[PDB]
């Protein structure tokens, strides 16, 4: 079902059909290989979402009860004092199934977080208490985003592969099969005419020899 | 990209102070830009949230992860839903003064289909 | 006798080829692709044969007792190449192991610097038998050394950079003109092989 050829290129279409079938067979399983991890990470993210939504509030409460033990504002000094970063991130690579995945590594740098904000004499110790709670919470929160990134990438890849498999299955194989059938019919069409020509020649020859021999009897 | 190092925060002070206390942020004097846009309840409008979201996502290559309160995202909820890219790793952080619901997430919206 | 047939379209369906294939002892088929890329001489190693490969070992062993096993190794490497070709094209080279990319990049090296030859030059117009044997041994040794290096544990992506010039030397091995003699090429090949072995030994650290 294309621009119909009629030559002896039947073998070419046959090889193309094997190639398409092989590609379909391989991709139909490469899809499921990634679908497994998609199913896994979906639950891994969903279950932990609410757990984190609650533990973060727990840590926020832990610091809130600390913020007024010294009986004074801490935020105004905090938002200016912070000038060094420790809980930054790094791009970690992990080809799960031959697919790139830039994951996040919690680049923890526990040597400094904010300089000269303790020891004033009323609240230095108190802030040192709930701070590590956030130090742990942020590291825990890094992994949720690390999983969301993989979720999005995996969704994209599975979508494209499944789309390609459907296209190949539905609008490639039948076209080639129709082409093969057409060429197969054409070959027999030519064979019939060749046979008929030879038959006519044989008829002429036998009639001529019958005439000659029936004449030579006398 | 390896520039995905800095962390973005658009949240109330009660959380921002503690986050900076943990050492996540700093001051960037090269632009005099903090790693966050502080939030004031009943004093900050919604256009500021959208502008800072766009600035952090499509104008700053430094941000790798963005933390935004549920109520703040509510002001740009449509903007957050419309934008879906892997680079910024947008995350609707739980918000202080509000018991966060782990079901308002724009990211989780796609999780809510095809279980 | 050395006949010659003209493929009238299909190089296997014409009755002349069918008749000849039943009585001939050797066959050197023609492939359109190596011609289209202008790859000379263009003969198809997938469909061709030489039934005399058995009776020749009596001469080989008295002359070059290693030639047959080297031929078998080369043939199997080449075959594995095209066997992986379909999967690597339909999916893309992103999940291949480190011992397989070696096979790919050695098959390409062989296909480009061993089976490629131009008779319109002076260095390579009539390659003798000893030169061919030496080149063949060198290629097999290089492949085995790369496989060993990955087996002992090393990412080939960087091992290729570390080795480097030993990949170029073999690719230039096809320039030792026979006019130099017969021993003055054998010495060069010996030193090349020794240098390759030492380079692979020292690059694992």
Swiss-Prot record, chain A:
Source organism superkingdom: Eukaryota
Keyword Membrane on entry: yes
Bilayer topology term: Peripheral membrane protein
Transmembrane segments: none
Protein role: Subunit of the V1 complex of vacuolar(H+)-ATPase (V-ATPase), a multisubunit enzyme composed of a peripheral complex (V1) that hydrolyzes ATP and a membrane integral complex (V0) that translocates protons. V-ATPase is responsible for acidifying and maintaining the pH of intracellular compartments.
Protein name: V-type proton ATPase subunit D
Primary location class: membrane
Record's subunit section: V-ATPase is a heteromultimeric enzyme composed of a peripheral catalytic V1 complex (components A to H) attached to an integral membrane V0 proton pore complex (components: a, c, c', c'', d, e, f and VOA1). Interacts with RAV1 and RAV2 components of the RAVE complex, which are essential for the stability and assembly of V-ATPase.
GO molecular function terms attached to this record: proton-transporting ATPase activity, rotational mechanism
Localization: Vacuole membrane
Gene symbol of the encoding locus: VMA8
Composition skew (Basic and acidic residues), residue ranges: 206-218
Record family assignment: Belongs to the V-ATPase D subunit family.
GO annotations of cellular component type: fungal-type vacuole membrane; Golgi membrane; membrane raft; proton-transporting V-type ATPase complex; vacuolar proton-transporting V-type ATPase complex; vacuolar proton-transporting V-type ATPase, V1 domain
From Swiss-Prot, chain B:
Cleaved signal peptide residues: none
Matches recorded under Gene3D superfamilies: ATPase, V1 complex, subunit F
InterPro entries: ATPase_V1-cplx_f_g_su, ATPase_V1-cplx_fsu_euk, ATPase_V1_fsu_sf
Membrane topology according to the record: Peripheral membrane protein
GO molecular function: proton-transporting ATPase activity, rotational mechanism
Keywords carried by this UniProt record: Hydrogen ion transport, Ion transport, Membrane, Transport, Vacuole
UniProt key word Membrane: yes
Note: Present with 4050 molecules/cell in log phase SD medium.
Family classification: Belongs to the V-ATPase F subunit family.
Described function: Subunit of the V1 complex of vacuolar(H+)-ATPase (V-ATPase), a multisubunit enzyme composed of a peripheral complex (V1) that hydrolyzes ATP and a membrane integral complex (V0) that translocates protons. V-ATPase is responsible for acidifying and maintaining the pH of intracellular compartments.
Xref: PANTHER family: V-TYPE PROTON ATPASE SUBUNIT F, VACUOLAR ATP SYNTHASE SUBUNIT F
Record text on subunit structure and interactions: V-ATPase is a heteromultimeric enzyme composed of a peripheral catalytic V1 complex (components A to H) attached to an integral membrane V0 proton pore complex (components: a, c, c', c'', d, e, f and VOA1).
Protein name: V-type proton ATPase subunit F
Organism the protein comes from: Saccharomyces cerevisiae (strain ATCC 204508 / S288c) (Baker's yeast)
Gene that encodes it: VMA7
């Amino acid at each position: 079902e294309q621009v119909f050829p009629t030559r002896m290129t039947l073998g070419l279409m046959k090889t193309k059909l094997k190639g398409a079938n092989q590609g379909y067979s391989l991709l139909k399983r490469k899809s499921e290989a990634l679908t497994k991890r998609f199913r896994d990470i979906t639950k891994r993210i969903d279950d932990a979402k609410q757990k984190m939504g609650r533990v973060m509030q727990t840590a926020a409460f832990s610091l809130a009860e600390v913020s007024y033990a010294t009986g004074e504002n801490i935020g105004y000094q905090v938002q200016e004092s912070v000038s060094t970063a420790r809980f930054k991130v790094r791009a970690r690579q992990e080809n799960v199934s031959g697919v790139y995945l830039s994951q996040f590594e919690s680049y923890i740098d526990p040597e400094i977080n904010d300089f000269r904000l303790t020891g004033l004499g009323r609240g230095g110790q108190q802030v040192q208490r709930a701070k590590e709670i956030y130090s742990r919470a942020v590291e825990t929160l890094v992994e949720l985003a690390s999983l969301q990134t993989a979720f999005i990438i995996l969704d994209e890849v599975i979508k494209v592969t499944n789309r390609r498999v459907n296209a190949i299955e539905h609008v490639i194989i039948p076209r080639t099969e129709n082409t093969i059938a057409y060429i197969n019919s054409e070959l027999d069409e030519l064979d019939r005419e060749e046979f008929y020509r030879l038959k006519k020649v044989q008829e002429k020859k036998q009639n001529e020899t019958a005439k000659l021999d029936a004449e030579m009897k006398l | 990209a390896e520039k995905r190092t800095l962390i973005a925060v658009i949240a109330d002070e009660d959380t921002t102070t503690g986050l900076l206390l943990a050492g996540i942020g700093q001051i960037t004097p090269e632009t005099q830009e903090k790693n966050f846009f502080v939030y004031q309840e009943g004093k900050t409008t919604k256009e500021e949230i959208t502008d800072k979201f766009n600035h952090f996502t499509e104008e700053r290559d430094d941000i790798a992860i963005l933390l935004i309160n549920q109520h703040i995202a509510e002001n740009i909820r449509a903007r957050v839903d419309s934008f879906t890219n892997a680079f910024p790793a947008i995350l609707e952080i739980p918000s202080k003064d509000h018991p966060y619901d782990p079901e308002k997430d724009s990211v989780l919206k796609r999780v809510r289909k095809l279980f | 006798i050395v006949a010659a047939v003209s493929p009238a379209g299909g190089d296997f369906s014409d009755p002349v080829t069918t008749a000849t294939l039943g009585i001939t002892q050797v066959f050197w088929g023609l492939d359109k692709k190596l011609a289209q890329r202008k790859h000379f001489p263009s003969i198809n190693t997938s469909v061709s044969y030489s039934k005399y490969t058995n009776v020749l070992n009596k001469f080989y062993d008295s002359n070059y007792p290693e030639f047959p096993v080297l031929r078998d190794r080369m043939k199997e490497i080449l075959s594995n190449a095209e066997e992986l070709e379909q999967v690597v094209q339909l999916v893309g080279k992103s999940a291949l192991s480190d011992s397989d990319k070696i096979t790919l990049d050695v098959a390409t090296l062989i296909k480009e610097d061993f089976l490629q030859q131009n008779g319109y030059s002076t260095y390579d117009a009539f390659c003798p038998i000893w030169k061919t044997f030496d080149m063949m041994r060198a290629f097999i040794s290089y492949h085995d050394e790369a496989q060993k290096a990955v087996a002992n544990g090393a990412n080939w992506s960087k091992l290729a950079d570390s080795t480097g010039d030993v990949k170029h030397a073999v690719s230039s091995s096809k320039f030792f003109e026979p006019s130099r003699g017969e021993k003055e090429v054998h010495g060069e090949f010996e030193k090349l092989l020794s240098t390759m072995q030492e380079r692979f030994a020292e690059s694992t650290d």
